[PDB]
Structure 1
Amino acid sequence: SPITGLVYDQRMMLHHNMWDSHHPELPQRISRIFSRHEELRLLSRCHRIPARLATEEELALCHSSKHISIIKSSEHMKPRDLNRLGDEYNSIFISNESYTCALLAAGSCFNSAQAILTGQVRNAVAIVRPPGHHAEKDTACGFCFFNTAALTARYAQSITRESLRVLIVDWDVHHGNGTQHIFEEDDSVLYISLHRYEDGAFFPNSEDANYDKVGLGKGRGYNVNIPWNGGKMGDPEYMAAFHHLVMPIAREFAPELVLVSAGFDAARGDPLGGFQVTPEGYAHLTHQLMSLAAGRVLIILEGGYNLTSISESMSMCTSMLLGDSPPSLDHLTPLKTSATVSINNVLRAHAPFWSSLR
């Protein structure tokens, strides 16, 4: 009986950009990742989980009725009207297939979480597009329509109990502004993001992503931002952040389910990120999170734009979930000075809330 689930459906390739056919969020992102799983003989080792559509009642766990109704109406618009609607948001393109593809991405992740929680599988991966982490309650943003990861947390609570403890780890190179805002006054969902910041000048261009935003109300302490400035970061800085911050806070919270907002745009070779994390580095981050929540872990694709880099990086994560031995990293070398400044600023902000840090 396979201990790892996998979901993929080629219908999610139909969303496309009719005015700019080389735009980086390409249909072949998901088909290239699936083909590499066949070449490495990983697909036959997994249990295949089918895709489905999310329902409109499920979308209302996080989104307004007006936002649901506007995106739904684009299914039948003519080209001139699709171009006008898209230009009303920050960095969005739309075709007649976009609404259906965003529904399939969300429902694929609901079926995966249900298989994990009922014990049919121990853990799982989801090869899905368009992405989710910039979408807000009332608007679309940054290539994203509905917030797939935030919806999956609320779905899991609805079928078990309202206070089920969920951790979301966001290792995409950009800040997830929508996920932060949805859970900002909530102590049942812990949000932890690592991201390129540059004093507010990198997308999405807001001071909401700095280390001093810690949560609101009864949610004070349950929002953790790790921002990078002035440096091309890689394996040494990401391992240091996990050892001093991510893993001590996670163990004290003691989650019952772990969701990864797993973009691969911090990887060596990415044309938007400019950073240097390796496939062996992503394998070590995956193996550390497998020690939490009695092993209940779901990996969800977000961004990432070098086709060879994302195919090798996500395949190594699946190999770790199946139980293979982790590969060795490069030799030890000094951290960059600005990265130690960032880690010290986060420790000073969260020490009042977490005894494992003081």
Structure 2
Amino acid sequence: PITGLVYDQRMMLHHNMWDSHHPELPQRISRIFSRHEELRLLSRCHRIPARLATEEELALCHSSKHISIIKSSEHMKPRDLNRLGDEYNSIFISNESYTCALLAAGSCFNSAQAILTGQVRNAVAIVRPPGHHAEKDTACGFCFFNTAALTARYAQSITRESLRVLIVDWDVHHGNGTQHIFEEDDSVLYISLHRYEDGAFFPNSEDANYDKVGLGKGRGYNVNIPWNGGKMGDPEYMAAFHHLVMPIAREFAPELVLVSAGFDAARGDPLGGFQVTPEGYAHLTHQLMSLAAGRVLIILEGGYNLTSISESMSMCTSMLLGDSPPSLDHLTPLKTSATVSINNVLRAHAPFWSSLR
């Protein structure tokens, strides 16, 4: 009954050499880790080592051209790095960026392997740069390689190709990369909750709407829960879980649960605009621990209030360790548009999930 934790301070090497105040700060991961110490959570975990992902492992999800280009940035001069990064949507690059994206992925590989071989029951991965906006053939939105997607495929590579993996993505932004990588796949169920605003919120694509349910045999295995017109928080996220995430997830019966755990929907985030509390994230984590016999891996994605993400992720680890969840009011009413959103998802996915009918 062990909880794993992976953290390597070398992941702070990735930085923005032209804007030292860019919100995707190196100290995002060091503040989360130090808060785990201060709360005496670190010493309760089994320390899992970081490692580099290999190029072969990156090819599980990414094209040879994309891997080659990001790999080449290790040797580039500053103005060439700036030119490269400017070619993407919302990317900065330093000569350490490739190595740090490899360490983020390999840390999660090591955690998933410890879970699937029974060395630990569950794990938390304090990693950067994030992953879920990265596509097979490009970088985007602070993300170089899709860590969560790679971890799902790595997981399958060391157990079965049929290993059922659920990815819950509670970052405030849609994981466009994760959706696309698994869109035609029924072995990996992708569920994303995100601020949508009728397609106006980043990453600015109607791919994130509720009517994108998957393709081919993947039809029904992509669940988008898009929020519109409202500052959402604990009541809305609890209700999405009760009405959508947990019924669908229980019917899918995953064998591994990956959380694309961005904390930019948190109260205090400078750009998410939402108000999920640390208690809220604890409730979500505890809910997910009822799946896959507790085999849950929490992977940091976004989140830009240093104190909010540190408190929020620490509460998640407290849940994985077996601490009792805080009691919340399941009877506070939802903001009006959130009911509309949840109903729109139920209509779209009832054809595929008997648990909704």
Change (3 A) 1:108 1:331: closer
Residue in structure 1 matched with residue 79 of structure 2 by the alignment: 80
Distance in structure 2 (CA, Å) of the matches to 1:291 and 1:214: 24
Q: Deviations over 1:204-233 (max 9, x none)?
A: 111111111111111111110000111111
Q: CA deviation at 1:332?
A: 4.0
The within-5 A match list for 1:1-358 is 3-329=2-328, 332-358=331-357
> How many Å apart are 1:108 and its aligned residue?
0.4
User: 1:153-173: per-residue Cα shift (whole Å, max 9, x none)?
Assistant: 111111111111110000000
| Structure 2 unaligned blocks of 5 or more | none
2:132–2:143 CA contact under 8 A, matched in 1 = yes
SS in 2 for 1:258: strand
Give the whole-Å Cα distance in 2 for the aligned partners of 1:269 and 1:56: 37
Deviation, 1:328, is 2.1
Displacement of 1:126 = 0.4
Deviation by residue 1:117-147 (Cα, 9 ceiling, x = unmatched)? 1111111100000000000111100000000
- 1:98 and 1:132 mapped to 2: Cα distance? 13
Deviation per residue, 1:314-358 (Å, 9 max, x gap) = 001111111111112258432111111111111111111111111
Q: Secondary structure at the match of 1:101?
A: helix
**How far apart in 2 are the matches of 1:256 and 1:76?**
40
Q: For residues 164 and 303 of structure 2, what CA distance do their matches in structure 1 show?
A: 28
Q: Give distance in 1, aligned partners of 2:332 and 2:238.
A: 12
Instruction: Tell me, in whole angstroms, the C-alpha distance in 2 between the residues paired with 1:317 and 1:82.
Output: 36
Return the alpha-carbon distance in structure 1 between the equivalents of residues 350 and 282 of structure 2. 29
- Distance in 1 (CA, whole Å) between partners of 2:78 and 2:233 is 42
3-state SS, counterpart of residue 199 of structure 1:
coil
| 8 Å contact from structure 2 (residues 164, 187) kept in 1 | yes
Q: In the TM superposition, what is the alpha-carbon distance from 1:22 to its structure 2 partner?
A: 0.5
Q: Deviations over 1:13-42 (max 9, x none)?
A: 111111111000001001101111111111
Moved more, 45-54 or 326-335: 326-335
Higher mean C-alpha displacement, 334-343 vs 321-330: 321-330
Q: Give 3-state SS (helix, strand or coil) of 2:231's partner.
A: coil
Cα drift, residue 80 of structure 1: 1.4
In the aligned structure 2, how far is the partner of 1:182 from the partner of 1:285? 25
Question: Residues of 2 paired with 1:167 and 1:217: CA distance?
Answer: 18
User: What percentage of residue pairs aligned between the two structures are identical?
Assistant: 100
2:314 and 2:194 map into 1 onto residues whose CA distance is 22
Contact 2:238 2:330 in 1 (8 A): no
The range that moved more, 255-264 or 69-78, is: 69-78
Distance 1:327 1:242 in 2: 16
Kept after mapping to 1: 8 A contact 2:240/2:342: yes
What displacement does 1:78 show?
Answer: 1.1
Q: Deviations over 1:91-112 (max 9, x none)?
A: 1111111111111111000010
CA-CA distance at 1:47 after TM superposition:
0.6
Report the TM-score, using the length of structure 1 for normalisation: 0.98
Per the alignment, in what secondary structure is the counterpart of residue 287 of structure 1? helix
- Partners of 2:284 and 2:131 lie apart in 1 by 21
CA distance in 2, matches of 1:223, 1:350: 9
RMSD in angstroms over aligned alpha carbons?
0.9
User: What is the deviation of 1:56?
Assistant: 0.7
2: CA distance, partners of 1:71 / 1:44: 36
Aligned-pair CA distance for 1:259: 0.4
CA offsets 1:61-101 (integer angstroms, 9 cap, x no match): 11111111111111111111111111111111111111111
CA distance, structure 1, for counterparts of residue 112 and residue 290 of structure 2: 18
Does the 8 Å CA contact 2:132/2:146 hold for their aligned counterparts? yes
Cα deviations across residues 189-248 of structure 1 (Å, max 9, x unaligned)? 100000001111100111111111111111111110000111111111111111111111
Q: Structure 2 CA distance, aligned partners of 1:282 and 1:204?
A: 23
Give distance in 2, aligned partners of 1:86 and 1:327: 42
| Farther-moved stretch of structure 1 (325-334 vs 207-216) | 325-334
Aligned partners of 2:235 and 2:334 also within 8 Å? yes
C-alpha distance after superposition, 1:260-309 (max 9, x if no partner) = 00000001110110111111111111111111111111000000000111
Distance change in 2, residues 1:315/1:335 (3 Å): same
| CA distance in structure 2 between the partners assigned to 1:71 and 1:333 by the alignment | 47
Give, in whole Å, the separation in 2 of the partners of 1:129 and 1:188: 26
Q: Is the CA contact 2:235–2:330 (under 8 Å) kept in the aligned structure 1?
A: no
Count residues in correspondence. 357
CA–CA distance in 1 between the matches of 2:149 and 2:323? 30
